[PDB]
Every structure is written in structure tokens, then in C-alpha cells.
Amino acid sequence: MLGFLSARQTGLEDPLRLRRAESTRRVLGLELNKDRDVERIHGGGINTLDIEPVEGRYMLSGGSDGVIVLYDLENSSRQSYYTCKAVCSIGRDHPDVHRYSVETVQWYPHDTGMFTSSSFDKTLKVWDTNTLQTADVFNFEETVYSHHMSPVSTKHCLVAVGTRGPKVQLCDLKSGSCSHILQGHRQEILAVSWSPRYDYILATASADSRVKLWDVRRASGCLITLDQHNGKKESANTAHNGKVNGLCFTSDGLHLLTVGTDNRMRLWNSSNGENTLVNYGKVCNNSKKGLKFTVSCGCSSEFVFVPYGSTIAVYTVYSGEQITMLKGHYKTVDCCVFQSNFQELYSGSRDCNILAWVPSLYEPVPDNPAFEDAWSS
Amino acid sequence: FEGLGPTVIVCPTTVMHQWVKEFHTWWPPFRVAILHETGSYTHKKEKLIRDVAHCHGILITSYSYIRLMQDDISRYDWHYVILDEGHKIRNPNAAVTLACKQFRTPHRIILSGSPMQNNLRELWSLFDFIFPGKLGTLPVFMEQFSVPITMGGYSNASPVQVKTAYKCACVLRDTINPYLLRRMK
């Protein structure tokens, strides 16, 4: 610690070294709400979370009852153990409320004045953050399992939505569109995620055990249908061995992470599509819906936090070793988000509470009355 | 492929002679072959097709020929499909439309001075050729685009219906702009 500081002011080590080292140390020291608490307004289980792309201050949340609650995640008070209050909530009284369970929500990249929520009521809604009303409503024939917006594209505002139908739907915020549709899948599309490196590259995961790398501009099918055993190469080339219900690109976009109900997790090269043969052990996954997970950014070695039953598992992205299990929840956890600036984690589960995982090893120095054994003598 | 690969052009039989002339007065290096009963080999036609595919030349074919041999032409990996008077595939259920759409080439160009003449089904068939995904399947396009616009054209619809026709036309007008270059005189 001190050696990292001294090596910084002296100039032996580049200043990024201490930051990456201290960042990865915070992730390893993650523990429950030592100085935090999330205000509970979700009557049902919480399905999704998203931190704003800029300034990472307000966090959306979508419950199983349809209410969507926008949160505040910094200590406006002097005292510690602050409670993460909710600036606003779109509840039952709202005229434009999701009648049924809202599956995933997302902040629009490049500004915080608009956010999109998609529910099981077969609709994707565009919202105005300031006025808390809608601007565009996109109805769909089948239920909606996921939707993603490109976090890096500046030439378009396409939102990719995967429905229970076997064919991807590409809606454009600019104009209405809602007609561009990608064919090549066979069953329910449980996860869609754009590539942070390439603007027009999209990954779609569906129940036919196939993940396809698409190019939206491309007018002829898919580019790569990822296979498991890297044979010579569709109605074949199964990406997993069951139902692929997860998708998370790495920080730089060079590799793809997928989770299926085969209790297996795989890391895939983004360009060619060959799997990198990182085994990850057994990753428990019985979810029949979209499973949301995240990957750490700005650390020495990237981490991946994937829901694991009633716990969250932390793995090294490339090494594939199990770091620790964050046993905090009582029901199954379905969404986890990562606060890049502060190396904190927020977990939404089905016990109707968002848990905050904050780095430990910083404690007040006294001059603990509860920390003693009471054994008789 | 290196350079321009094998290219197939489908035009009405009254247009093939003009097309072969233009290639000879704007780019001599291109080798252009015309598929016809008269032909230029007085032998089996498969031979000519194979030769063209091999030399990465340009093959000109009548529309009725594409219908006759739909499993033979499409298997030779053509690099460009250019349709002159492209409104000949305006009916999606027509066999000529089915034969024309079987090409697997991402690059497909339609030359039609009057793309739409009757209805938006006419437009969808052409756009399903150049870009199959852009406008979705016909049942979705028929219900979500054509019905709301063809109902709002009558001067008897309620003021909500006419505004719906405008919005549907506006969405349809700007989902086709990058793929339709339409310049009037």
C-alpha cells in the first residue's frame, strides 16, 4: 500500500499501476452494506438494475410487480450508513405504468434525460426522466425478455429487443422503424447485447442453444454462429447445451461472455467466434428468463459477477478462478450491476431488496462492544 | 474474391441488346454473355453459364429463364444481381419473384423507374429482395403499414385515423431512404 504510494511520487511505477492495484483490492474486499442501505419500494422481486453511463449517480430498478424506481447512490448526509433514497417512482397510480412485470431497464447512453423499460406486457417504453412520462411506446406480438441499446454508437439510436418469438426486433429511437427484423433463430430470444467496440455488431442468445453475432447493416444473415467444440464450419453449431439466457461483453469488447441453463459459462472471441476454453467450473443457472450479469472494469485483472442461485459468484475473466461467493440474499438473484468508479456492486433478487456490496478493510479507529464470545467459565 | 466477381443481370428480352451495347461503349474489358435460345454457342446452355461463372464475367439473362432454371443459376455464387425493370417481381407469390429471391448474394440491385404502382405490397416485394429484414414479413407489414395508410387516404376517416396514416407513412418513408435513390426529372 505504502510502497505503491512511494513508487508513485518517485516515478518508478506509472500512476495507473496503483489505481489498478487498489481497484482490484477493493473488489476482493467486497462485503455487504457496511455503510449503505437501499430504500425498499419494490413490493415484488426486483428484476433489473442499471447505473447511469455518466457520473454513475442514479440507478434504475424494475420489480416483478411492474413499478420502476429510480434511486440515488451517494451520501448527501454528513453521517455514514446513509440510505439510498429514491428520487422518483413510477407506481400503480401512474397512467402509463407497466401493468405486468418489467424485465429489464436501461439508461440511454450519452445523457441521463431518457431511459427505456421493457416488460412482460409486450411493450418497450421510452421515458422522460425529468417529467417521468413516456414519449414512445413500442408494442410487440409476444412477450419481451430483454432489450439493449448500443453504449458506443453515435450514428444511430437502434434498440435491439428480443421477444418470445424466434426473430429479433430492431427498433430505432430515431423515427419509429419497429420493422427491421433479424431472422436465423428458432426459439425465444432470451438475451441481446450490442458490442462496446463495434457500433453495428449485435449478439443474440436464444433458446435454440445458439448465439449469433449480427451486423445490423449486413443484409445477409448472421456473421458467426458460435459453437462449443470449435469444429470445421445453420441448424447446427450449438453455442451451449440448453438455454442460453445470458450475455455480457467484456470491458474492451474483445471477448464475449455467455451463461446458459447447462450450468456452464463460456468466454468467446468477439472477432472469429472461437471459444477460448476457459472452464469456470459449474455456474448454477436454472433461470428460464433473461439472466443479467456484469463484468468489472478498470482493475488489474477483469472480474465477472454472475448470479449463482441465492449468491453472486466472482471469477477472473481470463484465469477462470472462483474468487469468492457473496452470500447475502435469501431468494434467487437475477441482476447484478457494477459501479465502475467506486468498485461497488448492487444485486437485485426475488426477496424484494437491492443489496449493496461495498469494499471493506476501512474501519474507524477507536480511542467492538458487541464482538465478544459469551461462553461460561 | 479479388475484384468484381461473376455478375448476373436480369432484364426484359427487349432490353438485352441495349445492355450489351452499353458495356461495349462504356467498359470494353467486361466480358458480357447473353443467355437465350438463339444464344451464341448453338449447344447446351449450362456450358455458357459455367464458363461465365469461371471467368468472373457478366451474364445477361431473360426473366423467363430465371424461372425455368432456379436451382441451377443460384448455386454458382454470383457476386451481383441487377434487375432491369425490377417491378417484374412485384408480386411476392409469383414464381419469378421466388426464383429471383433465391440468390444468396448480399448485393442485389433493382432498376425500376416505377417501384410502386398499385399498393405497398408491391413495394414490400421489391424491398424483400434487396433487404429481406428491413420491412418485416408481409402479415406484419400489411397490418402495421399498408392498412393504416390505405385507410387514411379516404376523405372520410376520423381525425385520429388520418394522423395514423401520416405517422405510418413517415415511419415507412425514412426506413427506405438509404436503400432507395429516387430522382425525378
Binding site: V54, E55, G113, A135 | -
Partner: peptide
């Protein structure tokens, strides 16, 4: 006294969001 918007990280959800209301208020 505005709470959201601003603090630029293309279309900053004001030019684009007006288009949504310019076509859905019909």
C-alpha cells in the same frame, strides 16, 4: 434547478426526444 439532463458524456435526449413527441402527439 433541473435534476437530470446536461453533463455531456451525439443527440442529448432533447433533440431526439422532441421528435418522439413530434410524431406521437398526433
Amino acid at each position: 434547478k433541473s435534476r437530470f439532463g446536461k453533463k455531456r458524456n451525439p443527440l442529448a435526449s432533447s433533440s431526439l426526444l422532441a421528435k418522439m413527441r413530434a410524431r406521437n402527439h398526433l
